[PDB]
Design a protein around this ligand. Structure first.
Ligand SMILES: CC(=O)N[C@@H]1[C@@H](O)[C@H](O)[C@@H](CO)O[C@@H]1O
Ligand SMILES: OC[C@H]1O[C@@H](O)[C@H](O)[C@@H](O)[C@H]1O
Length: 601
């Protein structure tokens, strides 16, 4: 079988080889489809040489034929294709997506030497949800980084991107504090996902983990028997609580424009806490009788969100850990997808969830990457023959129609411990592994070493890189705006100082940033002031400063964002830019930027 990733579901080999010559063309000989044609024009360019795209002439030996035939939808589904490698290559699919995935395989087949052994496959995914999740909460993850991830996902036939993030709110401006995405930024991500055949699954977590929204709304916070508020927890016994959350959901769904909504619902309450929340107890018993629990009120709240989003043709998803068999009266609505990440205690088992007839996704903790914490051990998973049947706590003995797939999940828990560019490096093999496990073809090799070699040979998606990480040669520069230059000032501060001749040693790092070191003091430009979340300096307005250079301080790493006349400096961790403070000229971090001209010194 061919060395492609994910591997083909089957392969019937033949004799001979297809070879790409400068005579080859790309032939679209099915239905007219502008998306398929645009994708095909990119594909034609991603091959060596100069292939033209046509949709009027018959195919010929040596051509790559892309045949979109909607009548094949029953056989091939929305994402499958039929590949023939002969004297010509033929990809037959029912949809633009299926043709695209076929062309991902073709690129890999021709990568090494423009030749491919002959044969054929019907290649259809074993699972319908093949995912990566990124938690872009507290911190901000750049849109350029997301575009690169989407290209890489698409190149490996992954089709689902979960994003937990705050949208800068017009509905509730008191929640609009960094990190967030603007509505234009969200629409940019939406456009990217559509282009790369990826479904976005946005999340605002509720009714736990709401500290990023409830900080300025103490009236909505859950109180215990002692009267003590839990800042991250919404009081679901208050009607104003559901109204608040569904408002924020509505505002986010308008811009994300996704079919799915993920409301989270992880880490809200456990039964050992029930003596301390008699008001949730009371509210539950009032509604659902003498056996009802706080978990019944929780499940009901989720079902209410379900009804809300279903009214606008959307579908709901949650994490699994709040399903612990204590909802005595109120079952979770069956058309809510449950993403299983955690087992233990009385948490409901995968088998039990699947037996209930709901969609269940495997989002195992084992598939997590956590800044400063656990890293998915792809080698071990490969060596132990991990598949989506292997949930935390339980391995299923057979498949199920309602097991949707799996995803890897990226979390920022110790947010200053690792840059997004370092996470990008770390996720390379996880991404290929979950793509392989969910597409569902046979292993290319018994052991991991062969898989890894193949993955690294293929490398990133064609067109992956979307930035220039090293726009300045390493050296000493003055950084100027008008009459001012960046310079050291009082109390380890840095400012834009009129008529200053100060200069800085800029040196690229291995992870796509620069250190910025004062030629005067020898100290490094850093972000260590202001409010921290998850250990990271995320306050807009916080002053920048100088500190002893450190190889481990990720807050000393700066991204150079380029223009023709000037550049801006973005902190790797905070994702805010160096900005001049008007009152005193101090360099501070904000969502704007001061444009600086680099002048060799
Ligand atoms: C769904 C999920 O992973 N929930 C939480 C996550 O919110 C948090 O970052 C982590 C801290 O260790 O605990 C759990 O993993
Ligand atoms: O790492 C931070 C994240 O932790 C998890 C939780 O479900 C998210 O809502 C977010 O708080």
């Amino acid at each position: 079988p061919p060395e492609v990733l994910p591997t083909l579901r089957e392969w019937q080999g033949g004799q001979g080889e297809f070879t790409l010559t400068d005579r080859a063309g790309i032939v679209l000989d099915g239905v007219r489809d502008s998306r398929t044609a645009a994708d095909a024009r990119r594909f034609a360019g991603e091959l060596n040489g100069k292939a033209s795209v046509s949709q009027g002439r018959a195919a010929r030996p040596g051509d790559i034929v892309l045949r979109q035939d909607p009548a094949q939808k029953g056989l091939l589904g929305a994402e499958g294709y039929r590949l023939t490698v002969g004297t010509r290559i033929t990809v037959t699919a029912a949809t633009s997506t299926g043709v695209f995935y076929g062309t991902r395989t073709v690129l890999q087949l021709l990568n090494d030497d423009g030749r491919a052994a002959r044969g054929s496959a019907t290649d259809v995914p074993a699972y319908r949800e093949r995912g990566v999740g990124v938690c872009a909460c507290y911190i901000n993850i750049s849109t350029q980084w997301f575009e690169r991830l989407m290209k890489d996902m698409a190149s490996q036939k992954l089709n689902q991107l979960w994003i937990e993030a705050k949208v800068k709110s017009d509905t509730d401006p008191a929640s609009a504090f960094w990190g967030y995405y603007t509505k234009p930024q969200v629409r940019t991500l939406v456009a990217m996902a559509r282009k790369y055949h990826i479904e976005l699954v946005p999340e605002i977590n509720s009714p736990g983990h709401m500290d990023t929204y409830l900080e300025n709304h103490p009236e909505l916070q859950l109180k215990d028997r002692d009267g003590v508020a839990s800042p991250p927890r919404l009081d679901i016994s208050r009607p104003e609580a559901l109204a608040y959350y569904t408002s924020m959901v509505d505002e986010a769904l308008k811009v994300w424009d996704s079919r799915y909504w993920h409301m989270g619902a992880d880490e809200y309450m456990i039964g050992s806490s029930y003596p301390d929340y008699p008001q949730l107890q009371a509210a539950a018993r009032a509604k659902f009788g003498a056996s009802a629990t706080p978990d019944d009120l929780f499940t009901d709240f989720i079902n209410q969100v379900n009804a809300h989003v279903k009214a606008d043709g959307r579908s709901l998803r949650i994490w699994n850990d709040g399903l612990a068999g204590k909802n005595a009266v109120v079952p979770l609505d069956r058309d809510i997808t449950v993403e299983h990440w955690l087992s233990g205690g009385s948490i409901q088992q995968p088998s039990s969830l699947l037996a209930e007839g709901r969609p269940v996704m495997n989002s195992a903790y084992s598939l997590y990457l956590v800044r400063g914490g656990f890293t998915m051990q792809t080698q071990k998973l490969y060596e132990s023959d991990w598949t989506p049947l292997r949930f935390e706590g339980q391995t299923l003995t057979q498949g199920a129609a309602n097991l949707t797939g799996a995803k890897i999940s990226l979390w920022p828990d110790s947010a200053a411990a690792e840059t997004e560019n370092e996470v990008e490096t770390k996720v390379f093999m996880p991404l290929r592994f979950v793509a392989q496990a969910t597409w569902g073809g046979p292993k290319p090799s018994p052991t991991y070493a062969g898989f890894e070699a193949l993955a690294r040979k293929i490398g990133h998606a064609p067109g992956w890189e979307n930035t220039d990480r090293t726009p300045l040669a390493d050296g000493t520069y003055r950084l100027t705006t008008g009459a001012k230059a960046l310079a050291p000032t009082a109390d380890a501060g840095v400012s834009l100082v009129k008529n200053s001749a100060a200069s800085w040693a800029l040196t690229a790092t291995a992870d796509g940033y620069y250190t910025v070191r004062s030629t005067e003091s020898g100290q490094c430009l850093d972000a260590v002031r202001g409010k921290k979340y998850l250990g990271a300096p995320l306050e807009v307005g916080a002053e920048l400063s100088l500190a002893n250079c450190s190889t481990t301080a990720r807050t000393q790493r700066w991204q150079l964002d380029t223009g023709a006349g000037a550049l801006t400096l973005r902190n790797a961790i905070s994702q805010l830019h160096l900005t001049e403070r008007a009152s005193d000229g101090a360099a501070v971090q904000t969502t704007g930027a001061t444009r600086l001209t680099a002048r060799a010194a």
